[PDB]
Amino acid sequence: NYVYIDPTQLPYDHKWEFPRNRLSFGKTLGAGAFGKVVEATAYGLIKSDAAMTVAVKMLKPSAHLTEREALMSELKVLSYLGNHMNIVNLLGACTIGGPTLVITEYCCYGDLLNFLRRKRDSFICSKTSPAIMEDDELALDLEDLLSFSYQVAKGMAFLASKNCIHRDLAARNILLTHGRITKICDFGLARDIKNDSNYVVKGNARLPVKWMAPESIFNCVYTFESDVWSYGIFLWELFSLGSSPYPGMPVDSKFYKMIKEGFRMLSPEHAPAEMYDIMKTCWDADPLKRPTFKQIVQLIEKQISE
């Protein structure tokens, strides 16, 4: 019982406008064929006597009208959503006197997938041999993984409450910032998907097939519940410390058949049983039997308090 809004029709509130001459650009954080995101310093963005680090999304010279619309749509979507602790927050925009710039908080630890991949030595396998440890104030533990699961569920519950479907939920699209706070991000204009093997050609499009619900892959259906499927795959990435899902399996005819047949990933070693149970419910072939994000938050709350 929903229709899709054309995001180009959403309003842009001019309260966001910031002068471009108050930005100083630094290193590139991500880039695609037509766009990029740079770290920058903004002068007097929030308080007139303070400078702060921000991220800025912009187009490259190679961009056309569709990309110009795509960037303005990102601005309009964030303006619509408003702030939440667990999504990238809009801080301002430069829409006059030069190329469109969209300014958000800068997430200082980068994407969660790469972060998990460099924290693998915080964990060990279930074995019975003696182990030696080294002190490391920046280690991760199981409580951190549970916190990341909870924070991403709250961010997704927020999006669902605003009638928003993210459509590319994955550890690579979740950022980490000060306080180990996770922020769901739109990586549009910030990745060249043609060179990311996680995006597979299926017909006309390059799609993150290992993260996608069967109704999305096979029927081009996208709902709140298809995002829940992807959240289940994200949990698997989380408790597997950044393993690629379906490890060792290419996306081919066999993969598609096995998904339809009901095959699912097995529990990661470091997943609590209750967390694997959640993943399994997120992967029900019937979208109506998957939990909602509001339900997931309620469940993870129960286990975090116990």
Ligand X SMILES: CCn1c(=O)c(-c2cc(NC(=O)Nc3ccccc3)c(F)cc2Cl)cc2cnc(NC)cc21
Task: Copy the structure tokens of residue 257.
Answer: 């058949």
Question: Of 70-78, 117-125, 196-204, 295-303, which part binds ligand X (CB under 6 A)?
Answer: 70-78
Number of residues located near ligand X, criterion CB under 6 A: 25
Count of beta carbons in the 10 Å neighbourhood of residue 123 = 16
Residue type, 76: K
Please identify which residue in 166, 172, 210, 290 interacts with ligand X, judged by CB under 6 A.
Answer: 166
- Whole-number minimum distance, CB 255 to ligand X, in Å? 28
102 binds ligand X (CB under 6 A): yes
In this structure, are residues 76 and 11 in contact, taking their beta carbons and an 8 Å threshold?
A: yes
Minimum distance of ligand X from residue 40's CB (angstroms)? 9
29 scored as a contact of ligand X (CB under 6 A)? yes
Q: Is 179 annotated as a binding residue?
A: no
Confirm or reject binding of residue 56 to ligand X (CB under 6 A).
yes
Non-local (6+) Cβ contacts of 216 within 8 A are: 222, 226, 229
Q: How far is the CB of 186 from ligand X (least distance, A)?
A: 3
- Residues labelled catalytic: 168
Instruction: Single out the segment in contact with ligand X by CB under 6 A; choices: 1-9, 62-70, 184-192, 231-239.
Output: 184-192
Q: Is 276 annotated as a binding residue?
A: no
Name the residue among 119, 110, 81 with its Cα closest to residue 171.
Answer: 110
175 binds ligand X (CB under 6 A): yes
Integer distance in angstroms from the first to the last C-alpha of the chain?
37
Of 101, 119, 120, give the one whose Cα is nearest residue 109: 119
Q: Write each residue from 186 to 215 as x if it is in contact with ligand X (CB under 6 A), else as -, in one continuous string.
A: xx--x-------------------------
User: From residue 108, how far is each of 133, 189, 223, 260 by CA, in Å?
Assistant: 27, 19, 31, 40
> Which residue, 31 or 299, has its beta carbon nearer to ligand X?
31
* 3-class SS of residue 105: strand
Q: How far is the CB of 190 from ligand X (least distance, A)?
A: 4
> Shortest approach of ligand X to residue 278 CB, angstroms?
21
R_g of the chain computed on alpha carbons: 20
55 binds ligand X (CB under 6 A): yes
Distance in angstroms (rounded) separating the CA atoms of residues 166 and 180: 22
Q: Tokens 């909602």 belong to which residue?
A: 292
Q: In terms of C-beta density within 10 A (0-12 exposed, 13-18 middle, 19 or more buried), how is residue 211 classed?
A: buried
Q: What residues are designated binding site for ATP?
A: 30-37, 57, 105-111, 172
Residues that bind ligand X (CB under 6 A): 29-30, 37, 55-57, 74-75, 77-78, 87-88, 102, 104, 106-107, 110, 159, 166, 175, 184-187, 190
Q: What residues are designated binding site for Mg(2+)?
A: 2, 173, 186
